[PDB]
Design an enzyme around this catalytic site. Structure first.
Site, mmCIF file in Angstrom:
data_model
loop_
_atom_site.group_PDB
_atom_site.id
_atom_site.type_symbol
_atom_site.label_atom_id
_atom_site.label_comp_id
_atom_site.label_asym_id
_atom_site.label_seq_id
_atom_site.Cartn_x
_atom_site.Cartn_y
_atom_site.Cartn_z
ATOM 1 N N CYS A 57 0.737 -1.122 0.099
ATOM 2 C CA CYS A 57 0.166 0.013 -0.007
ATOM 3 C C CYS A 57 0.759 1.275 -0.143
ATOM 4 O O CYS A 57 0.259 2.337 -0.513
ATOM 5 C CB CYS A 57 -0.838 0.096 1.620
ATOM 6 S SG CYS A 57 -1.642 -1.518 1.897
ATOM 7 N N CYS A 60 1.699 3.334 -3.205
ATOM 8 C CA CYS A 60 0.741 4.566 -3.677
ATOM 9 C C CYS A 60 0.468 5.480 -2.564
ATOM 10 O O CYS A 60 -0.141 6.657 -2.995
ATOM 11 C CB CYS A 60 -0.487 3.806 -4.092
ATOM 12 S SG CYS A 60 -0.112 2.911 -5.555
ATOM 13 N N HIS A 61 0.242 5.111 -1.445
ATOM 14 C CA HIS A 61 -0.269 6.007 -0.261
ATOM 15 C C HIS A 61 0.931 6.640 0.534
ATOM 16 O O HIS A 61 0.628 7.586 1.264
ATOM 17 C CB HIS A 61 -1.357 5.427 0.370
ATOM 18 C CG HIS A 61 -2.695 4.985 -0.264
ATOM 19 N ND1 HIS A 61 -3.667 5.955 -0.663
ATOM 20 C CD2 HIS A 61 -2.926 3.959 -0.723
ATOM 21 C CE1 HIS A 61 -4.412 5.405 -1.301
ATOM 22 N NE2 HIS A 61 -4.221 4.129 -1.327
ATOM 23 N N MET A 98 4.234 -6.530 -9.111
ATOM 24 C CA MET A 98 4.712 -6.865 -10.455
ATOM 25 C C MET A 98 4.675 -8.598 -10.358
ATOM 26 O O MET A 98 4.518 -9.187 -9.541
ATOM 27 C CB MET A 98 6.529 -6.770 -10.486
ATOM 28 C CG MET A 98 6.541 -5.036 -10.294
ATOM 29 S SD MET A 98 5.911 -4.274 -11.990
ATOM 30 C CE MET A 98 7.519 -4.756 -13.126
HETATM 31 C C1 DHE Z 1 13.423 4.186 -9.788
HETATM 32 C C2 DHE Z 1 13.697 3.002 -10.721
HETATM 33 C C3 DHE Z 1 14.428 2.926 -11.820
HETATM 34 C C4 DHE Z 1 15.372 3.821 -12.371
HETATM 35 C C5 DHE Z 1 16.785 3.467 -11.869
HETATM 36 C C6 DHE Z 1 17.943 4.232 -12.345
HETATM 37 O O1 DHE Z 1 17.872 5.707 -12.869
HETATM 38 O O2 DHE Z 1 19.155 3.849 -11.986
HETATM 39 C C7 DHE Z 1 14.101 1.491 -12.202
HETATM 40 C C8 DHE Z 1 14.785 0.936 -13.512
HETATM 41 C C9 DHE Z 1 14.700 -0.273 -13.827
HETATM 42 C C10 DHE Z 1 15.466 -0.979 -14.914
HETATM 43 C C11 DHE Z 1 16.175 -0.201 -15.844
HETATM 44 C C12 DHE Z 1 16.558 -0.473 -17.079
HETATM 45 C C13 DHE Z 1 17.230 0.665 -18.051
HETATM 46 O O3 DHE Z 1 17.453 -0.015 -19.179
HETATM 47 O O4 DHE Z 1 17.733 1.487 -17.444
HETATM 48 C C14 DHE Z 1 14.931 -2.123 -14.682
HETATM 49 C C15 DHE Z 1 15.561 -3.339 -15.848
HETATM 50 C C16 DHE Z 1 14.190 -2.645 -14.098
HETATM 51 C C17 DHE Z 1 13.720 -3.578 -13.662
HETATM 52 C C18 DHE Z 1 12.710 -3.947 -12.738
HETATM 53 N N1 DHE Z 1 12.122 -3.046 -11.731
HETATM 54 FE FE1 DHE Z 1 12.556 -1.219 -11.728
HETATM 55 N N2 DHE Z 1 11.302 -0.866 -10.095
HETATM 56 C C19 DHE Z 1 11.222 0.332 -9.371
HETATM 57 C C20 DHE Z 1 11.901 1.574 -9.540
HETATM 58 C C21 DHE Z 1 12.932 1.678 -10.620
HETATM 59 N N3 DHE Z 1 13.303 0.853 -11.383
HETATM 60 C C22 DHE Z 1 9.982 0.013 -8.120
HETATM 61 O O5 DHE Z 1 9.647 1.139 -7.379
HETATM 62 C C23 DHE Z 1 9.477 -0.917 -8.840
HETATM 63 C C24 DHE Z 1 8.152 -0.766 -9.470
HETATM 64 C C25 DHE Z 1 9.177 -2.038 -7.600
HETATM 65 C C26 DHE Z 1 9.743 -2.194 -6.698
HETATM 66 O O6 DHE Z 1 9.540 -2.031 -5.227
HETATM 67 O O7 DHE Z 1 11.078 -2.380 -6.859
HETATM 68 C C27 DHE Z 1 10.443 -1.563 -9.576
HETATM 69 C C28 DHE Z 1 10.095 -2.951 -10.267
HETATM 70 C C29 DHE Z 1 10.826 -3.671 -11.170
HETATM 71 C C30 DHE Z 1 10.973 -4.997 -11.558
HETATM 72 O O8 DHE Z 1 9.829 -5.899 -10.895
HETATM 73 C C31 DHE Z 1 11.841 -5.300 -12.603
HETATM 74 C C32 DHE Z 1 11.013 -5.570 -13.843
HETATM 75 C C33 DHE Z 1 12.857 -6.343 -12.328
HETATM 76 C C34 DHE Z 1 13.489 -6.452 -11.165
HETATM 77 O O9 DHE Z 1 14.793 -6.733 -11.114
HETATM 78 O O10 DHE Z 1 13.385 -5.901 -9.989
HETATM 79 N N4 DHE Z 1 14.044 -1.260 -13.104
HETATM 80 C C1 HEC Z 2 -1.736 2.173 -6.231
HETATM 81 C C2 HEC Z 2 -1.618 1.386 -7.517
HETATM 82 C C3 HEC Z 2 -2.477 1.704 -4.943
HETATM 83 C C4 HEC Z 2 -2.383 0.585 -4.248
HETATM 84 C C5 HEC Z 2 -1.053 -0.291 -4.308
HETATM 85 C C6 HEC Z 2 -3.395 0.857 -3.135
HETATM 86 N N1 HEC Z 2 -4.247 1.944 -3.191
HETATM 87 FE FE1 HEC Z 2 -5.573 2.738 -2.022
HETATM 88 N N2 HEC Z 2 -6.280 4.083 -3.516
HETATM 89 C C7 HEC Z 2 -5.448 4.209 -4.502
HETATM 90 C C8 HEC Z 2 -6.372 5.300 -5.353
HETATM 91 C C9 HEC Z 2 -5.966 5.342 -6.808
HETATM 92 C C10 HEC Z 2 -7.417 5.338 -4.682
HETATM 93 C C11 HEC Z 2 -8.839 6.251 -5.035
HETATM 94 C C12 HEC Z 2 -8.360 7.428 -4.639
HETATM 95 C C13 HEC Z 2 -7.122 8.543 -5.439
HETATM 96 O O1 HEC Z 2 -6.073 8.793 -4.773
HETATM 97 O O2 HEC Z 2 -7.493 8.678 -6.531
HETATM 98 C C14 HEC Z 2 -7.151 4.660 -3.356
HETATM 99 C C15 HEC Z 2 -7.992 4.787 -2.462
HETATM 100 C C16 HEC Z 2 -8.116 3.914 -1.077
HETATM 101 C C17 HEC Z 2 -8.815 4.267 -0.010
HETATM 102 C C18 HEC Z 2 -9.963 5.379 -0.122
HETATM 103 C C19 HEC Z 2 -9.769 6.702 0.641
HETATM 104 C C20 HEC Z 2 -10.805 7.546 0.603
HETATM 105 O O3 HEC Z 2 -10.795 8.862 1.023
HETATM 106 O O4 HEC Z 2 -11.740 7.105 0.174
HETATM 107 C C21 HEC Z 2 -8.224 3.511 0.988
HETATM 108 C C22 HEC Z 2 -9.049 3.204 2.452
HETATM 109 C C23 HEC Z 2 -7.204 3.038 0.593
HETATM 110 N N3 HEC Z 2 -7.055 3.254 -0.712
HETATM 111 C C24 HEC Z 2 -6.244 1.920 1.173
HETATM 112 C C25 HEC Z 2 -5.227 1.288 0.739
HETATM 113 C C26 HEC Z 2 -4.688 -0.064 1.355
HETATM 114 C C27 HEC Z 2 -5.271 -0.368 2.884
HETATM 115 C C28 HEC Z 2 -4.028 -0.595 0.331
HETATM 116 C C29 HEC Z 2 -3.129 -1.743 0.584
HETATM 117 C C30 HEC Z 2 -3.938 -2.903 0.803
HETATM 118 C C31 HEC Z 2 -4.056 0.382 -1.082
HETATM 119 N N4 HEC Z 2 -4.934 1.282 -0.701
HETATM 120 C C32 HEC Z 2 -3.444 -0.038 -2.052
HETATM 121 C C33 HEC Z 2 -4.243 3.684 -5.159
HETATM 122 C C34 HEC Z 2 -3.719 2.450 -4.605
#
Ligand code: DHE
Ligand code: HEC
Ligand code: DHE
Ligand code: HEC
Lengths: 559, 559
Positions: A57, A60-61, A98
């Site tokens: 969570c 995103c939050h 992912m």
């Molecule tokens: C901030 C960021 C960058 C830029 C790095 C830089 O500038 O040096 C990046 C780049 C990357 C790049 C850069 C490719 C390039 O050509 O520059 C790759 C291959 C990559 C493979 C993955 N990334 Fe990445 N990635 C994140 C964040 C980022 N990834 C996440 O926050 C995310 C979404 C989830 C997480 O918690 O880690 C995430 C999941 C993944 C994967 O599941 C991937 C596919 C596989 C893995 O090894 O984890 N990320």
């Molecule tokens: C990103 C992909 C998300 C993840 C992962 C989770 N949430 Fe989320 N949440 C997201 C959106 C786009 C929204 C709608 C509001 C907005 O920002 O556009 C929400 C909303 C909630 C709410 C409702 C809040 C309200 O004021 O009505 C709750 C209680 C909430 N989300 C909780 C929550 C939890 C517990 C998560 C992990 C299980 C979670 N979110 C994941 C986007 C995303």
């Protein structure tokens, strides 16, 4: 009402790639007391909920619940919503993470109640991670004076590929011509990125848990010569690339704490830590958790280029003087993620992904030049793809996670002023869920994956466009579909193809055929001139192969 | 041993001047829940404790309790100490605040327990204050186009003095030649500082509560033409002083939230808010409450000079482009407070008071050039005193809160190289507890107050040194003692004399004879040529007169 979760909390092709703070989630936390009208959770219940929150969570939050792509969930707001609404909303689960390692987003009834209750309590901020902690973790295994003065192995270093073996906490160093695995090195943590010093001698890897390893490719047996931890959650690293500053510095970017760290390029000594806490560029409101996303290095000035996500700021950090620190804080667009330099290496082009924009910075003048909507949903370029379009001139391309579109932006203000920083074309590739687009100066082809697509055949294939045939007449350019996963011959699961990377000569392009930790994976090498299968790389050590970085193309920013 | 409080919390001449967050204290706060093993406070009890904490304790320990000059008092630490220790320690009483309005530092038994319990609970952070909040508070009373196009009163504006009538939240505009109180203006809460735009037309005042008022001195009846709130606690304001940038901008610094704000110089429109949260320069640890202290304006570049106290950073903020914001973050020394420019207006010399250091910045080159210990305890220069010492050359002087010393630092690196940035002399004045030292280019005298001295004879007097008689022999220069309070003819609870300020010609110097809100105060004007009493300003409206700012000397940074 709670049923609005069907639109916002279900899985999209473009909402599966927000941070999963699964390293930070391993920390135990204290259960808070609960004020009047709120019920406390026990230590176990609170930790159980915290782990779920951080893994699923917080991307995103926010860990502090002040909002990122999803809105704030601070106790003032959630107590007004109330437990019943929260319980009903959270019953629907949350977006999957992912493939292969991420969450399914499904919650049991007990977990739903834990989450609703957790959201009504006051959260603490996770621990900071400063210089004392970094220096405690800092180990120089081979001092600079004890390292070689010339290459002492017979490898072709510039043609080597550094491959992430994700879930094994290792990297593989693979010969780009013979496909031999030259070495498998332990990092001890999952590596996200490999980056090379400007001379090509030093290989830097950063793990998702904030651990950095530096490897000396000149040793007879290359290994980690220095290591350090720079935070609890991190995803980016880069090296100094200004002429005259080769091998001087490395920089790491963290998600938690929100900070970046400049390190000595030879020893990893931590020299300067900068917090990224600050104000959003547009609303000018304080944000307590502005994560560092991509980090690039200027070729025009002795600066690092740092994306600060939630505040929408691009930082140009001058490393010539770390005591009297000069920076340019550029107001850009919120939700900056990845990007790359144009072909001339002057302009940084980056996706503010949740707002569907490309932001362009002039690294020579140190200023914002343009912000343009791609017309697609959630652009995700990686470093992107620069090429010369037969009609439009120099362009940079990106594909998208939220739809099948490929967008081209003109990158030549001097020679093609009417096309500069404008979206010149948009056309479909295989399908939604694309992550990486790729080309090379010696290739006539533009390759586009579709890793996160929900259709197995699509996620196992790559679209290839013939740049020479592009006219830019508004029609949709045809593409060839390469059955990459089929070529790898993997019976189990639905392996996902991800990230093209070229060899040094730009004659072969590699793709990862990524399956889970207990399944079979491969790397597939494509002959660029013919678009035919060149080689399939399989080895018992090749576990969850993901990112691949050719030494030469990474050290020179050739993409 | 809780008896350590007898030393730790003893009132001294140099620990009475840490922030009292009595405006922020007015906000009502709800009680947090209490974790297992901790007793809760009711909403009323918690709010009572919070008010005391903010007024008397947060200056040294932080509103977030992460420490300032005093150590952190976060719940992890205080729960380890335990209630008994905390109760015993706090029973001894804490350091008194400033004379006349500050706390006595004494608590009732009930209040001691409230404090011990409050320290065991988890504090919330007070509310942020961003652009939306600033714009809601922004009022333009007279639009620029509706203001005069030339001076419409017959006042000698350059010779006018703007005097803080502290407790009443007013300022007195007093004629520098006739000593007439021309007008008394109300702003609400205590004004801390008056600053002038570079043209001398606009008078800016900053209230301790974060309220900024801009007054048009060209009006027939000068009054506020615009106002805005920029935080909850603030003490500093400055105007743009680079040639070509006259009247363009104003900047305000806040204690809470930790930020500075650049505003339009004609309307007060808020343009750019910058957080000062960040890392300490030396140990490079995150600090969540780095207060903005003095703010000066460069005469060499279009920049503001911002002291960030707890992190020990001096920021040079370039206001030529607020979107692509260029700053220089200079690592200095922790506990930066006040300071001034040298006589040439090129070098900023500032006290890192708790560490007894003067930090020198070259504003032309944007770099630190020196850090020197004064040999004294807790330097407190105000803007300091520049003069050409007969044998040492150009120097800048400071007195100290913690001892009777006056220190001189050489300020001429090109012309007196061996003397530059070195403490050239140190000598005694009246006694400890000094706040302000003053001179003027047309005077041969150096005036030093002793406001916080415990002896009435000393706190009501000023020392005056004859600069022309100063030699380079190492002996201590003699001083004349002026009985300023005696000259005022007031018999009340030892009114304290504070801050010399000269008229435009540098022929007369004014001192405040500062008594309590329900007592009689005065201003004393001294003839600089004869060192004799010239005139006493007394009026029923002259309540708690403190800071005095002559328009010309403030606009031009003449000190
Ligand atoms: C901030 C960021 C960058 C830029 C790095 C830089 O500038 O040096 C990046 C780049 C990357 C790049 C850069 C490719 C390039 O050509 O520059 C790759 C291959 C990559 C493979 C993955 N990334 Fe990445 N990635 C994140 C964040 C980022 N990834 C996440 O926050 C995310 C979404 C989830 C997480 O918690 O880690 C995430 C999941 C993944 C994967 O599941 C991937 C596919 C596989 C893995 O090894 O984890 N990320
Ligand atoms: C990103 C992909 C998300 C993840 C992962 C989770 N949430 Fe989320 N949440 C997201 C959106 C786009 C929204 C709608 C509001 C907005 O920002 O556009 C929400 C909303 C909630 C709410 C409702 C809040 C309200 O004021 O009505 C709750 C209680 C909430 N989300 C909780 C929550 C939890 C517990 C998560 C992990 C299980 C979670 N979110 C994941 C986007 C995303
Ligand atoms: C940050 C700061 C500055 C520099 C301003 C700038 O650069 O524009 C300053 C300057 C000042 C100056 C600037 C003199 C100059 O010549 O520049 C004066 C006269 C002054 C009179 C007082 N100050 Fe001040 N002062 C504080 C802070 C500051 N005081 C406090 O935090 C403190 C200790 C307590 C508080 O909560 O306010 C405090 C109490 C006082 C007083 O009790 C004084 C004596 C009287 C009063 O009006 O409050 N402070
Ligand atoms: C600045 C002048 C102070 C004010 C005002 C208050 N305190 Fe303080 N405190 C200060 C010092 C210099 C010290 C000693 C430790 C150090 O930082 O050098 C302390 C210590 C305490 C403690 C003891 C903590 C421990 O770990 O032993 C407590 C509990 C404490 N102070 C509380 C406190 C309260 C409640 C105050 C308002 C009434 C207060 N302090 C004011 C400096 C200063």
């Amino acid at each position: 009402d709670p049923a609005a979760a069907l639109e916002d909390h279900k899985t999209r092709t473009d909402n599966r790639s927000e941070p999963s703070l699964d390293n930070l989630a391993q920390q135990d936390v204290a259960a808070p007391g609960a004020p009047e009208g709120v019920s406390a959770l026990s230590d176990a219940q609170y930790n159980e909920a915290n782990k779920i929150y951080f893994e699923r969570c917080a991307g995103c939050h926010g860990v502090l619940r002040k909002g990122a792509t999803g809105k704030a969930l601070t106790p003032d707001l959630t107590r007004d919503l109330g437990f019943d609404y929260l319980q009903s909303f959270i019953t629907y689960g949350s977006p999957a993470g992912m493939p292969n390692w991420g969450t399914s987003g499904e919650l049991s009834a007990e977990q739903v109640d834990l989450m609703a209750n957790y959201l009504l309590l006051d959260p603490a901020a996770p621990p900071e991670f400063g210089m004392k902690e970094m220096r405690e973790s800092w180990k120089v295994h081979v001092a600079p004076e004890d390292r070689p003065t010339q290459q002492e192995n017979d490898w072709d270093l510039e043609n080597l590929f550094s491959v992430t073996l994700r879930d094994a906490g290792q990297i593989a160093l693979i010969d780009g011509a013979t496909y031999e695995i030259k070495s498998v090195l332990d990092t001890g943590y999952a590596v996200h990125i490999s980056r090379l010093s400007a001379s090509g001698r030093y290989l830097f890897v950063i793990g998702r848990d904030g651990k950095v390893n530096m490897i000396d490719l000149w040793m007879k047996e290359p290994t980690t010569v220095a290591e350090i931890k720079i935070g609890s959650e991190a995803r980016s690293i880069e090296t100094s690339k200004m002429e005259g500053w080769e091998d001087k510095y490395a920089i790491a970017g963290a998600y938690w704490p929100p900070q970046y760290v400049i390190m000595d390029g030879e020893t990893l000594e931590p020299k300067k830590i900068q917090s990224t806490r600050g104000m959003t560029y547009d609303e000018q409101e304080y944000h307590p958790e502005p994560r560092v996303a991509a980090i690039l290095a200027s070729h025009y000035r002795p600066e690092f280029i740092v994306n600060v996500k939630e505040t929408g700021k691009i930082l140009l950090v001058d490393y010539t003087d770390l005591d009297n620190l000069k920076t340019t804080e550029i107001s850009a667009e919120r939700f900056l993620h990845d990007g790359g330099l144009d072909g001339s290496h002057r302009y940084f082009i980056t996706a503010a992904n949740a707002r569907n924009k490309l932001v362009v910075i002039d690294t020579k003048e140190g200023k914002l030049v343009a912000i343009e909507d791609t017309g697609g949903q959630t652009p995700h370029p990686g470093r992107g793809a620069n090429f010369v379009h037969p009609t439009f001139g120099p362009v940079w391309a990106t594909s998208h996670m939220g739809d099948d579109s490929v967008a081209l932006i003109g990158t030549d203000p001097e020679g093609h002023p009417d096309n500069a920083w404008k979206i010149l074309d948009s056309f479909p590739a295989l399908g939604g869920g694309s992550l990486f687009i790729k080309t090379h100066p010696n290739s006539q082809y533009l390759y586009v994956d579709a890793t996160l697509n929900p259709e197995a055949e699509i996620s196992g294939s790559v679209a290839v466009f013939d740049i020479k045939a592009m006219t830019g007449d508004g029609s949709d350019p045809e593409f060839k579909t390469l059955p990459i996963a089929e070529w790898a011959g993997i019976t189990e699961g639905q392996p996902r193809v991800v990230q093209g990377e070229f060899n040094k000569d730009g004659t072969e392009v590699w793709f990862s055929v990524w399956n889970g930790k207990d399944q079979e994976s491969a790397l597939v090498v494509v002959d660029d001139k013919t678009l035919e299968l060149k080689h399939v790389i399989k080895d018992e050590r090749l576990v969850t192969p993901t990112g691949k970085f050719n030494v030469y193309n990474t050290m020179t920013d050739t993409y």
